[PDB]
Write a protein that binds this DNA or RNA. Structure first.
Lengths: 56, 56, 56
DNA sequence: GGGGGGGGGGA
DNA sequence: CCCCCCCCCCA
């Protein structure tokens, strides 16, 4: 799960737990894919949205 | 083809065209889906990276 | 790629293959976006036709 | 495995 | 809407 910028590990980590509770999902191997994936989906969606903001 | 932040359309377009040149691919109907697709993959990668950077 | 109705996956899959054959198009990354796209166009066309028929 | 963000098409 | 891609991230 390496990132482009490892120094951001802390950042995403916060946003991760944030989105988790929002959708009400428990990031664990005992959970479905559509559940663990929905999180990573929102994370990417937000990172993109922010980047598009600092360019508009 | 609505973007998350349509106000960035012009910025992402210039990014698209510049990446196409750097990649040597000529965007178009007659281009392979792989070549066209690669430009879109770079946009997301760079946007995600820039987000992580200017954040964490 | 998640279709409106995932359960239709198998059916659209067969229609796709049958359309590819009629068109003489080989679906793939190295195939032009136009050739690949042509197939998706027929699929939507036939689906809309079926819906208009079984609707009166 | 999944979700999301982009690229190029066709109907 | 469907087709073919590429990328990011979660697990």
């Amino acid at each position: 799960a390496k990132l482009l910028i490892p120094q951001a590990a802390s950042a995403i980590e916060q946003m991760k737990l944030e989105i988790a509770s929002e959708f009400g999902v428990q990031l664990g191997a005992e959970t479905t894919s559509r559940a663990n994936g929905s999180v990573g989906g929102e994370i990417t969606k937000r990172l993109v949205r922010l980047a598009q903001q600092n360019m508009g």
